[PDB]
Structure formats: C-alpha cells, structure tokens
C-alpha cells in the first residue's frame, strides 16, 4: 500500500532524490570544513571563513527542501552516512575556491541527471522543482566561483603575500 498522497511518483525518482539529499548534506560538510580551515591561527582569513560558512548553511537548506519534497510526494526519506570531506587542510584560499568549483559542477551534473530521470518518468512536477530551486542556483554558484578563482589567480594567489589577504578584505569583505 503506497502513501495515500503518492501520485505519478516513480520509485526510481524517490531513490534518486534520496541520493541527492546525501550529496547536499555532504556539500554542507565540505564547506563547514573549509570555513574552520580559514579561522585557523596559521591561516586567519576571516572573510573566506564567513563565505564558506554561508555556503555550508545554504547546502543544508538545499538538503531540507529535497527532504520536504520527498514527504510532499509521499516518498520515504532514507538517510545514509555523510562522508567526511577529502581534506582537513585546504592549503590556501585559491585551492579551496577551486575545490568548491569542482564540487559545484559535480552537484550540477547530479542535478542534471536527476532532471533527465524526471523527464524520462514523465514527472513535470519534479522537473519544475529542480528548475525552480536547483538548476539556476547552481549556474549562479559556478559562475561566482569561476569569478573568484579568476581574480585570485590573476592577483598571484597563493604565493603572492598580499593576494589572498586583499581578496579576503575587498571581494569577500
């Protein structure tokens, strides 16, 4: 017996949504890691720290919106371990921005696969949800990180002593 709410909601979509929830929580955790890297006494770039912390909290919102969608559609949320980030030392402002950019493109590819699946299962509600709340948000994030990486590289990060310091103060400040 399915949910009395469930309608036109494919089991494969339910499962893909649970995989997406894990990926969003993972991304939250990556950014939380980055945030506290920047507030080390031997790094001390407070606006990089604030930036990544804000990203971490936004990833939690992305996760919750998918958990709500699961409930709305009569799916059942199935949580899995949240894997720790690949690094605990993020090396530099530039390196963390580059890692974030790769992570955002990977999440985007996941969301595009999810939309393709929704399209295959004739679920326009799911397609619209991803278009309204996920796809443009990812385009905006990737473009912003691309901008940041570009500026840091041009400024001489990470080796030029003033580069990360000034970018912290001006762009992220």
Please report how close the Cβ of residue 130 comes to its own copies at its closest, in angstroms.
Answer: 7
**137: annotated binding-site residue?**
no
Per-residue three-class SS string for 120-164: HCCCHHHHHHHHHHHHHHHHHHHHHHHHHHHHHHHHCCCCCHHHH
User: Out of its own copies, Fe ion, none, which partner does residue 61 contact, by CB within 5 to 8 A per kind?
Assistant: none
Tell whether residue 16 is a contact of its own copies (CB under 8 A): no
Task: Tell me phi and psi for residue 18, to 5 degrees.
Answer: -65, -40
Report the residue number, 12 or 64, with the smaller CB distance to its own copies. 64
**62: annotated binding-site residue?**
yes
How far is the CA of 141 from the CAs of 59, 61, 82, 159, in angstroms?
A: 12, 15, 22, 26
Report the residue number, 30 or 172, with the smaller CB distance to Fe ion. 30
Binding site membership for Fe cation: which residues? 24, 59, 62, 104, 138
Binding site membership: which residues? 24, 59, 62, 104, 138
């Amino acid at each position: 017996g399915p949910s009395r709410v469930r309608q036109n909601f494919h089991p494969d979509s339910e499962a893909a949504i649970n995989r997406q929830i894990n990926l969003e929580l993972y991304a939250s955790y990556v950014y939380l890691s980055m945030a506290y890297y920047f507030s080390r006494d031997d790094v001390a770039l407070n606006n990089f720290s604030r930036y990544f912390l804000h990203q971490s909290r936004e990833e939690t919102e992305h996760a919750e919106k998918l958990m709500r969608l699961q409930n709305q559609r009569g799916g059942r949320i199935r949580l899995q371990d949240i894997k720790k980030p690949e690094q605990d030392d993020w090396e530099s402002g530039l390196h963390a921005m580059e890692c974030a950019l790769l992570l955002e493109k990977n999440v985007n590819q996941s969301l595009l696969e999810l939309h393709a699946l929704a399209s295959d299962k004739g679920d326009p509600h799911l397609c619209d949800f991803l278009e309204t709340y996920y796809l443009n948000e990812q385009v905006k994030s990737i473009k912003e990180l691309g901008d940041h990486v570009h500026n840091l590289v041009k400024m001489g990060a990470p080796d030029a002593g003033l580069a990360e310091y000034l970018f912290d103060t001006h762009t992220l400040g």
